[PDB]
Structures are given as structure tokens and as C-alpha cells.
Amino acid sequence: REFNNLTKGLCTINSWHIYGKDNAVRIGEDSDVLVTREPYVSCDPDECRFYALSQGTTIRGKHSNGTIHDRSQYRDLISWPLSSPPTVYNSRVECIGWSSTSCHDGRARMSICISGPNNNASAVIWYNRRPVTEINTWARNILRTQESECVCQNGVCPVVFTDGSATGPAETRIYYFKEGKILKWEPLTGTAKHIEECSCYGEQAGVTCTCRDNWQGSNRPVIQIDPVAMTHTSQYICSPVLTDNPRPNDPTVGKCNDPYPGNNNNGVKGFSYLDGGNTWLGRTISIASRSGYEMLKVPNALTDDKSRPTQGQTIVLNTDWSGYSGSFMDYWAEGECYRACFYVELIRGRPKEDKVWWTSNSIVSMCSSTEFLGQWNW
Amino acid sequence: REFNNLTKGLCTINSWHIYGKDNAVRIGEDSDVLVTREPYVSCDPDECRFYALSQGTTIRGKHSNGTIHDRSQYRDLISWPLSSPPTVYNSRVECIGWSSTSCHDGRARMSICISGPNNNASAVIWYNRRPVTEINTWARNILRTQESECVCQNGVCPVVFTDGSATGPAETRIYYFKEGKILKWEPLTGTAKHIEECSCYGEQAGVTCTCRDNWQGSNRPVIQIDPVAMTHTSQYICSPVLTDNPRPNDPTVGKCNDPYPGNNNNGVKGFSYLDGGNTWLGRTISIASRSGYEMLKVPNALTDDKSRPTQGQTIVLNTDWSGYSGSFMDYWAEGECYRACFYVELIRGRPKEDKVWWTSNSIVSMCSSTEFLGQWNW
Amino acid sequence: DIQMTQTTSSLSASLGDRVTISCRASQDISNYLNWYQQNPDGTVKLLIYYTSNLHSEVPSRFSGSGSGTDYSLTISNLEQEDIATYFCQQDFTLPFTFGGGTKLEIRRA
Amino acid sequence: EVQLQQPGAELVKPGASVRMSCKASGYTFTNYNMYWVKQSPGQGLEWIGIFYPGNGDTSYNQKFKDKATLTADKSSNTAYMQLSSLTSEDSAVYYCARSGGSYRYDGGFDYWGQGTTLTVSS
Ligand SMILES: CC(=O)N[C@H]1[C@H](O[C@H]2[C@H](O)[C@@H](NC(C)=O)CO[C@@H]2CO)O[C@H](CO)[C@@H](O[C@@H]2O[C@H](CO)[C@@H](O)[C@H](O[C@H]3O[C@H](CO)[C@@H](O)[C@H](O)[C@@H]3O[C@H]3O[C@H](CO)[C@@H](O)[C@H](O)[C@@H]3O[C@H]3O[C@H](CO)[C@@H](O)[C@H](O)[C@@H]3O)[C@@H]2O)[C@@H]1O
Ligand SMILES: CC(=O)N[C@H]1[C@H](O[C@H]2[C@H](O)[C@@H](NC(C)=O)CO[C@@H]2CO)O[C@H](CO)[C@@H](O[C@@H]2O[C@H](CO)[C@@H](O)[C@H](O[C@H]3O[C@H](CO)[C@@H](O)[C@H](O)[C@@H]3O[C@H]3O[C@H](CO)[C@@H](O)[C@H](O)[C@@H]3O[C@H]3O[C@H](CO)[C@@H](O)[C@H](O)[C@@H]3O)[C@@H]2O)[C@@H]1O
Ligand SMILES: *[C@@H]1O[C@H](CO)[C@@H](O)[C@H](O)[C@H]1NC(C)=O
Ligand SMILES: *[C@@H]1O[C@H](CO)[C@@H](O)[C@H](O)[C@H]1NC(C)=O
């Protein structure tokens, strides 16, 4: 119980070893597994868990008919033991809402979940089993936050919300909370045209995030946040390796400060570990649909304009459906540098498989290795 | 929290009392029990548990069709309360992989599980809820380890891997780990022609193991490991009581330093407590198939060439299918000498019962007695 | 759309000479352009993909080059049967858009 | 020996529904996206959609999304397409084609079908 501080570096990421996989749908065909979607995994100083927004019913249960819809009264944020299924006798409900984020600060944990009608949406920050503060919709058009863990330096945890339009401008704000209470907030500042759903990781006393420009960008907007002076900055990843889905095909040259054109109005949540030369990016392997997954070594892609991959490792085949990705790290593991971990939501059902009236998923997660481990597909 | 040290002797084993039995299949016909295989039981200074590689589905569930195959993306190492069924709401997943070993060292616990394609298999040693080190395939042909508990003296835990051919030579290595980190490794040294799957037990500051010579041997290869000077030695059990399954029939004389001929290419995992005169061996009672089980007193069999049984006790009848066996011991029970415990996997399904498309099992375990207790069958 | 453009649908050649055709894109399409020839009746074949690369069975004489917005095919030793409607198209991003096409006419007898 | 065999015509009536076929020959059907493209009597070529046969994904052009659904019967390596509520304005010729890319929407439509003529009549 001492507020954790980001005291370390990223380690040399050369391979990726498995961390978790819950075989949820296959268990769920004969067990009281809940219908979820949008998952993430986060740790507290003695336990790591899987998280997801449930749709308040079991898969084989009749109320699963209609779970393609992703915002309603019945969704609850749930946590469940590492690599377990979200089972009705297991999952802990955290809060009631349809968008979230949780991070343990060092002393106790904070979780935010938004509920509401689309014109009257509300965020309540619970810190450590009780609610502490509420935020109401500043721009009355679906208040949303990230769906991955937040990161905390010294009691201060930066987290990002966006309320507005998806198809063109919205008001996103950075918020800093210490023990549930608000300390400040800021408008977005930078060249990043539009940001929403942000994968954040903390590394050497600052936190960095990749988000989604749903409006124009096929390259990813970036926000680098300084927690101590409570300041931030946005831009795009400079690469030709385009990572949003759908994208255009891979260009020879890229755009550092403006969004990359072609495909527009649409996008997926994703992560990156941009640590200079030690930079690995992830993307779908299919230009048009969430099918497949891969990790690629693209040294200096945040700054280098014509950055192309020097090493790779495939996680999911193009034949197998994937879904949202994002980053987490165990800040409490013993070491000199943090080990980069990540997850991929493996979606299953509607829209792509129209012969079931439900939509649910699995998860698979992976952390860095120093060795050049052999690749497999999951 | 002090690294345990092997400070005791084996006790006079005169009988065997029951320790555990989980009636898994009978419960599983109407409960959310997982499909497993290859089980073992191991203890930590305040709890003993049953372990097994699950096949990621329930028995009565449709994805059980095809669980005769024993290496895939969906297998997870699970632990579950002593004598419980591996139930979907119970079993703790430990790691993801299709071959394993776990031992508590005294302070915390280590578990290793191998995953991979057959030409690109990976071992990741988790120590105490986080991954610590990774090993990659030195001989690219199915990297495997033992499927029983390892044993730990003073922070150092010896464990054994084999990567290579089953039908003739492979490269097996002894590895010493302290708190997850590697301290050294060695090639196999000794007359033991081939070793794989090793039942190990620690007794008076050293550890000893029986393994399987899949290539030639019908007698068992033995590795005696000294943890402190980190050295080892192999040989065969000197007996005529042949214990591998399939074997040839019982010979008058035996072979101490070379494998015993006749039946070749095949074998089962098994254990022994070779403590001089206090030596009990176990085997299948059927020459050709894993049916039945028995324990036999064969005084001095490791050294004596024409050793035949002076006492016996039957565990499973020839009419009832058995499967893998191996050893464990509670090093934390109060005493002067350790009590020898063991398990027998009771396999059930394919190949032997072709009228079900699955393959699963039960477990039964037993520990020594000083009294001459009456025998039963389980 | 992504505007794909081909200026005018006709050109002549007195059968023997080297001819050039040019496609324009509405944005810098990195270099993902391809050329398609429709035979006098139906049949469309592929000749060049990614601006310069020839397909499996191609006459040695068909060239392609360009950058960004404007991309040209050159046919050198105009062997008559090669007279038809050529089309450019992109696949920088989908929808795929094709040009309008240019039929070639000959002038000799 | 890439044969995308397609009939020369279909003669139809206003408002009904016809169903196209493109019999893929001499390659691995499960491994390449099939592409459907329209050529109306005095216009350049309009692509309608894609179908990846070994996973089942489909993607449609903005306007076409209403009129065309793409299908395939993998045992007969037939790609298909149902256009419903045909009329004068869609009397044209339709093609199937495959990309050189085996799942990539890249490298261009490398082998093309015959082209089947759609004539609506009373
Ligand atoms: C340590 C190591 O060697 N790593 C290798 C790895 O080795 C395996 C090993 O094979 C296994 N063992 C044995 C005994 O063989 C054991 O596991 C190890 C790993 O530990 O193999 C992988 C796979 O081969 C290697 O990864 C490659 O690395 C090179 C760098 O040298 C990259 O260029 C490769 O990426 C590109 O190729 C991929 C196919 O392999 C492709 O799917 C990927 O997207 C990359 O290609 C795209 O981008 C190019 C330009 O940026 C472009 O030219 C391509 O045409 C392609 O673009 C197209 O496709 C995109 C979607 O895929 C699309 O967006 C785009 O628009 C366009 O249509 C590969 O990572 C690893 O280094
Ligand atoms: C304390 C005590 O008395 N223990 C006895 C035990 O007593 C029971 C008691 O009966 C019960 N109470 C009452 C009121 O009766 C209460 O429980 C107690 C135990 O606490 O009974 C058992 C069973 O009788 C005793 O075990 C035997 O001990 C003798 C030593 O004197 C052994 O020789 C016996 O083993 C052999 O016989 C078995 C059948 O009983 C047989 O299945 C086993 O495999 C042994 O025989 C094989 O090896 C011989 C040479 O090595 C060979 O000649 C045999 O033909 C046989 O070989 C064949 O079969 C093998 C597979 O079984 C095969 O591999 C081989 O190739 C060949 O074909 C027995 O353990 C206990 O001492
Ligand atoms: C965390 O770091 C700050 C400096 O930014 C320091 O003042 C504070 O005392 C540290 N807290 C702990 C738990 O070390
Ligand atoms: C364990 O035994 C070693 C001698 O091999 C000794 O040095 C060490 O201090 C002992 N540890 C404990 C917990 O007694």
C-alpha cells in the first residue's frame, strides 16, 4: 500500500510467449458462461485478471438473441480469474455501464463505467468498492472512455474520454484522478484530428497511448501524457505500415502529422510499444475485416516516415476472426525493465457468422521474450 | 517462507492406505467437469492438490469429440482441490501448454509448461503467478518434460526435458532452476540409453527418478540427481520384475546396465521407491495393455540382478483400465521420515472403449503405512 | 469514388509504331495501378499490376510506369491484334475504380 | 488452368431475381477472393463485391449492397450472386474475377470469367 511510481524501462522485445487464453465459447457450449465482448486484462500487486463488458445472459440462454447490440441497461463490467471463462458463478461485477477502464494505483483500484441514454450519459468513478465522483455529459452524444487499463504514477492516473461525433469532430478530454477525486482535466492538444478508444502503457515516468481516429485516419493518433506536470501531446505514427482496419494498402512514404487518406469513417482499437528501435506494432492481417492478427518490428516508426518491418510474428491466421486489441503490463513483477504484454479479442458470431443470433468472444494474451521463441497461431 | 531442505529418510513401507480418489467421470456425466488426461498431485506447505492437462471442454459437451489427440492450442495445465472433480468453476488454470511439471520450493511455487508446433516448441517457467524465463527447442522435435512434480532442495529444483526422437536417440537435458532463473543444465550422462517422462522424489538431500526408455527398454532407466553439487547419473533397474508396459514376460535373470530386450518402441510413465531393502516397485498387471495396477516388494532391485517379489498389494484389477503412474510426497508433514505417496491415472474412453468419441480419466492416490493394512481395489 | 481518369476513348496508329496511353488518379495512390485489355469480343486480360509488372503471358513490348497520379502504358511494336480497349484501375483502397477505357484504331489501307 | 466458366446469358423479367454462377476451375478455390464486376452497355467497369471462400467474408460496393448478395457452393467450386428486382436500368454484363492475392485485395484481378449477359424483357 504505497502509490506505485514508473521507475523502469521496456525490455528488449524479441519474441512473444503466451500468457493467457480462455477457451470461453468451447466451454460455454456446455457451462454457465456469460455473453461478453470488449475485453482487457489488468493486474493489481498480487493478481492479474481478465475483464469484459457482459451482456447479462449466458450464451446458450435465450436472451443471447440480440447481443449484437452493445449498449443497454443490462451490461455490467465484470472481472474473472486469469484464464477462467466469465462464468455466472465466478465473475465479479465491478460496476454497471457500457464503456470502462480500471487500473490499480498501488494502494487500491479505480474503475470508471459509463451508462446512460445517448443524450444523457453518466460516468461514475468508483474507487475501491465504493463510488467517489460523477461526471455528466459535456457534449451529449455518447460519452465513452477507453476499454483497456489506465496507468497510474504516484496516486495520479491519467484517463481519456470522448463525447461527440464519430464521423467528425468531438470533444475529447484528458482527466487526472487521484484516489477517485478529480484533480484537473484538459482538452485534447495536438495534431491528432480525432481520437477515441486509447491503449495506454506507462514506462519511464510518463504514459503513452495509441487511440483510434474514426473520422479520417488509417495511421494511428498518439497521445503522450506526462502525469507529474499533468500535460499531454498528440500526433500520428509516421509509418507506411498502416494498422487500422479497414485501411488502404501499404504506402511507400507515410504522413507524420496528419491522418492518412483513403478508407474513412470506421476503425478498430489497437496498441503499440513505441520504444525507439525497440518498437513493435500490431494490426489485422486483413485490409477489410477483423480477420487475423500479427505483430511486426518496425524500428523507429513514430518518427521515421518510411518505416517498414525488420522482423515479425503472427498470432491469429487470416482465416480466423480477431477483434479489438490493446496493451497492459504487470508493473509489480520483480525486475529492471517492464515486460510488454497485450491482448486480442477473438470475436465470434454476428456479423460475420450470421447463423447464430448472438455475438460473443474469447481472449488470448502474450508478453515479451528475450529469446527468439518459435511462433504458433491461437 | 524459507527454502525447504531434504532433511529426512523414507519410512518403512509395509502397506498402502488410500489418500485420494476423485470419481470424476461419474460426477461428470451430470456436472461441469473438464476433459483432462495426464494427472499428478503435488503439495505446497499447507495444501495438496490434484493437477492435470485439460482439453478445454466438458465431457458431455460436443467439443469432447476428438480428445484422443493430446497436443493442441486449447490445453491448459489446471490444479483443483484435493479429491474434487476438475470442474469449470473450481480448477485454477496455471499456464497454457501440453506438457508440464510444478513443485513448490519452500518459498513460492514454480510450474513449467510447453506449448508449440512440433518443430517450434517453447517452455516458459512461471514462478509464482508470473513468467520468469523461456527455453526454446534445442532439437526441434517435440520438446517435452515430465508430468509429475519436480523436487526442490534449498532453492534449487532439478527438472528433466527431452527433445528429439522417441524411436531412437534424442537429447535429454537436466536443468536446475532457482526462483525461476536458470542456474545451469547438463546433457544426460550414464548408461541409460533413452529417458523420457520422469517420476522423481527427493529423500536424503538428493533426488532420484525412474523415467521411460521408449526406444529399447522394458526395465526402467534411472537418474539419481545430486542437487547441491548439481550432478547426476543414469542406469537401469537390475531386476527380472519388468515393469514397463508392454513388456516381455518375467525373466529369471535381469540386465543392470543395458535395456532389456523383446518389446520395443513404446512404454508408460511409472514410479518406484528404491530405498535399499525398503523398495517397492509398481507396474500394470497386463503385459500388453494398460489394465490393472499392483505394488510389489522387491528388496534391493536397483542392485540385485535376480530380484523377485517378497510381498505385494494390488490396487486396480486386470479387468479395470489404468494409465500413467508417478510419485509425490508431502515434504511439509510433521515427522522423522517421509511418507511415500503415489498416483495412478485411471484412463477411460478411446482407444480401448471405442463407443465414446472422447478420452478422459479419474485419479486414485495412496501413501505408505507401518501397519499391514488389508488390500481393496479402486 | 477515387476518380480514375483516362483522357478520351480513341487513338490511331499506322500499324507498326509505338503508342502511349495515360491514366490519372484523384489522389496519390502510392503505385497500386494495373492495366486491362479487353479483346474486340468480351475477354479482358491482365497485362501489368503495380504499375510496372507484367502478368504471366505477356508480349515483351508492353511497358508501364508512373508515380502518384499519372501512369502510362507504352506498346512498342504494334502488332495489329493488340488493337482494343485498354483500362487502368487501382487497388490502393476499395472500392476498386476503373477508368473509362480507350479503344485503339488503325489507319493503313 | 484457371477456368472461371460463366453462361453466355440469362433472360429475365422485370422485378424478379436471377442467380449467377461462376465455376472456378484449375486452382485452390478455398484460397483466393472471388470478385464480381459489372459492365453496363456504354460505361466503364463497376466492381460490385468480394467473397473469400475459405472463411466466408463478403464486402459490397456502396450502391450495390442492396441489389447483390454473394454466395458460393464450395463442393462445386461455384461462386454465385443473387440480384433481386432487376429492371431495364440493370440490363448489363457481369463477370467474376479473382485477385492474384489469395486473400489480399492486392495484385489485381488476374484471371477473369466469360461475362454473362443480363437481359430483362417482357
Ligand atoms: C526470428 C525469425 O526468424 N522470425 C521470422 C519468423 O520465423 C519463424 C520460423 O519460421 C519458425 N521456424 C521454422 C523452423 O521455420 C519458428 O518461429 C519463428 C519466429 O520466432 O517467420 C516470420 C514469418 O516468415 C518472419 O516474419 C517476416 O519478417 C519479414 C522481415 O524480414 C517481414 O517483411 C514479413 O512481413 C511481411 O510479410 C508477411 C508474410 O510473411 C506479410 O503478411 C506482412 O503483412 C508483411 O508484408 C506486407 O507489407 C509489405 C510492405 O510493408 C508488402 O510488400 C507485402 O506485400 C505485405 O503487404 C500486403 O499485405 C498487408 C497485409 O498482410 C496489407 O496491409 C498491405 O496493404 C499489402 O496488401 C514477416 O513479418 C520473422 O521475421
Ligand atoms: C500382508 C500380506 O499377507 N500380503 C499379501 C496379501 O494379503 C492380503 C490378504 O489376503 C487379505 N486378507 C485376507 C483375510 O485374506 C487382506 O489384505 C492383505 C494385504 O494387506 O495378499 C497378496 C495377494 O495374495 C500377497 O501378494 C503376493 O505376494 C507374493 C510373495 O509371497 C508374490 O509372489 C505375489 O506376486 C505374484 O503373484 C501375483 C498374484 O497373487 C501376480 O499377479 C504377480 O504378478 C506375481 O506373479 C508374477 O511374477 C512371478 C515371478 O516374478 C511369476 O512366476 C508369476 O507367474 C507372475 O508372472 C506372470 O504374471 C505377470 C503379471 O502379473 C507377468 O508380467 C509375467 O510376465 C508372468 O506372465 C503377490 O504379490 C501379499 O504378499
Ligand atoms: C514517487 O515519486 C515521486 C517523485 O515524482 C516521489 O516524490 C514520491 O515520494 C515517490 N513515491 C514513492 C512510493 O516512492
Ligand atoms: C539448507 O541446507 C544448506 C546446506 O546444504 C544450508 O546451508 C542452508 O542454510 C539450509 N537452509 C535452511 C532453510 O535451513
The CATH number of residue A72's host domain is 2.120.10.10
Shortest distance, CA D22 to any CA of chain C (angstroms): 15
Any atom of ligand 1 within 6 Å of the Cβ of A315: no
Q: For A180, what's the count of Cα atoms within 13 Å in the CB-facing half-sphere?
A: 14
Tell me the C-alpha distance between B11 and B4, whole Å.
19
Chains B and D touch (3+ CB pairs under 8 A): no
A299 lines ligand 1 (CB under 6 A): no
B6, B203 in Cβ contact below 8 A?
Answer: yes
Q: What is the largest CA-CA distance in chain A?
A: 53
Task: Please list, in sequence order, all residues whose beta carbon lies within 8 angstroms of the beta carbon of residue B187, skipping any fewer than 6 positions away.
Answer: B171, B172, B173
Q: Please confirm, yes or no, whether A324 is among the known catalytic residues.
A: yes
Q: Cis bond leading into A246, ω under 30°?
A: yes
- Identify the nearest ligand to the CA of B285 by its number: 2
List the one residue out of B135, B149, B188, B144 whose CA is nearest residue B165.
Answer: B144
Q: Which residues neighbour B272 within 8 Å (Cβ) at sequence distance 6 or greater?
A: B199, B210, B220, B237, B243, B279, B280, B281, B282, B327
Judge whether A70 counts as a catalytic residue.
yes
Neighbours of D2 (CB within 10 A): 14
The amino acid that residue B234 corresponds to is S
Q: Is A26 on the interface with D (CB under 8 A)?
A: no
Number of domains in chain B: 1
Which run of H or E residues covers position A26? helix A24-28
Count of CB pairs separated by less than 8 Å, A with B: 91
Measuring from atom 37 of ligand 2, which residue has the nearest CA? B312
Residue A133's closest CA among A175, A174, A162? A175
Counting ligands in written order, the one closest to the CA of B246 is 2
Nearest-CA residue for ligand 1 atom 11 is: A374
> Are C42 and D105 inside 8 Å of each other by CB?
no
C-alpha B231 to ligand 1 mean position (Å): 43
Check pocket membership of B154 for ligand 4, CB cut-off 6 A.
yes
State whether C98 and D46 contact (CB < 8 Å).
yes
Resolution (A): 3.0
Which residues are C32's β-sheet partners? none
Q: Does A185 touch chain B (CB under 8 A)?
A: no
CB contact, 8 Å: D31 with chain A? no
Q: Quote the CA–CA distance of B123 and B185 in Å, as a whole number.
A: 14
Q: What domains lie within chain C, and their CATH numbers?
A: 1-109 (2.60.40.10)
- For residue C92, the chain A residues in CB contact (below 8 A) are 248-249, 262
- Residues of B at the annotated binding site for Ca(2+)? 213, 217, 244, 266
The reply to whether A32 touches chain B by the CB within 8 Å rule is: yes
Ligand 1 pocket check: which of A250, A260, A281, A310 to mutate, most ligand atoms within 8 Å of Cβ?
A: A250
Closest-CA residue of chain D to A248:
D105
Torsion over CA of B125, B131, B135 and B141, rounded to 10 degrees?
80
β-pairing, D9-12 vs D116-120, is parallel
Interchain contact, A30 vs B57, CB within 8 Å: yes
Ligand nearest to the CA of B229: 4
Residue bearing cell 495426464:
B38
Both ends of chain B: CA-CA distance in Å?
37
**How many residues are present in chain C?**
109
How far is residue A293 CA from its own chain's centroid?
A: 15
- What's the gap in Å between B153 CA and the centre of ligand 4? 9
Q: Which residue has 484516489 as its cell numbers?
A: A179
Q: What is the DSSP string of B101-138?
A: EEEE-SSSEEEEEEE--TTS-EEEEEETTEEEEEEE-S
Ligand 1: atom nearest CA of A15 is 20
How far C7 CA lies from chain A's nearest CA (Å)? 23
CATH of D1-122, one of 2.60.40.10, 3.40.50.720, 3.30.413.10, 3.40.50.300: 2.60.40.10
Chain B residues whose CB is inside 8 A of the A373 CB are 122, 134, 136
Coil, strand or helix at B171: strand
Query: Which of A127, A201, A324, A338 is the catalytic position?
Result: A324
Render B291-316 in DSSP notation, one character per residue. Answer: EEEEEEE-TTTTT-TT---SEEEEEE
Indicate if ligand 4 lies below 6 Å from the C-beta of B5.
yes
Alpha-carbon span B123 to B119, nearest angstrom: 13
Name the residue range of residue B366's domain.
1-378
Asked if residues A374 and B122 have their Cβ atoms less than 8 Å apart, the reply is: yes
Grid cell 513505441 — which residue?
A274
Give which of A354, A363, A361, A353 is closest to A59, Cα–Cα: A361
User: How far is B23 from chain A, CA to nearest CA, in Å?
Assistant: 20
CB-based contact B346:B362 (threshold 8 Å): yes
Helix ranges (DSSP H) in B198-346: none
Inter-chain residue contact D44 with C100, CB threshold 8 Å: yes
Of A13, A242, A271, A315, the closest CA to residue A147 belongs to: A271
> Which residue in the set A82, A333, A374 is minimally distant from B136, CB to CB?
A374
Question: Is A339 annotated as contributing to ligand binding?
Answer: no
Which atom belonging to ligand 3 lies closest to the Cα atom of A228? 5
Number of residues written out for chain B:
378
Amino acid at B105: D
Smallest Cα–Cα separation from B323: which of B245, B247, B264? B245
Closest CA to B212 of B158, B143, B150, B272: B272
Q: In sequence order, which residues have a C-beta less than 8 Å from that of residue B116 and are 6 or more positions away?
A: A374, A376, B122, B137, B143
Distance (Å, whole) CA B222 – CA A324: 50
**A265 part of contact set with chain D, CB < 8 Å:** no
State the ligand closest to the CA atom of A228: 3
Ligand 3 test: best mutation among A1, A5, A105, A107, most atoms within 8 Å of CB?
A5
Query: Under an 8 A CB cutoff, do A31 and B58 touch?
Result: yes
Task: Give one DSSP letter per residue of A118-171, joined into a string.
Answer: TTS-EEEEEETTEEEEEEE-SSSS-EE--SS----BTTEEEEEEEEE-SSS-EE
b/e per residue C12-30 (b: at least 16 CB within 10 A): ebeeeeebebbbbbeeebb
Asked if C64 contacts C71 with a C-beta cutoff of 8 angstroms, the reply is yes
Task: Determine the Cα–Cα distance for residues D101 and A72; give it in Å rounded to an integer.
Answer: 41
Distance of alpha carbon B143 from alpha carbon B324, whole angstroms: 19
Interface probe for A, chosen from B98, B128, B130 (most Cβ of A below 10 Å), is B130
d(CA A230, CA A259): 26
Q: Which atom of ligand 4 is nearest to the CA of B4?
A: 13
CA of B312 to the centre of ligand 2 (A): 5
Q: How far is C21 from chain D (nearest CA, A)?
A: 16
Closest ligand 4 atom, residue B153 Cα:
1
Q: Is A354 exposed, middle or buried (0-12, 13-18, 19+ CB in 10 A)?
A: exposed
Which phi and psi angles does B100 have, rounded to 5°? -160, -175
How far is C96 from D36, CA to CA, in rounded Å? 11
CB contact under 8 A, C94 and D59: yes
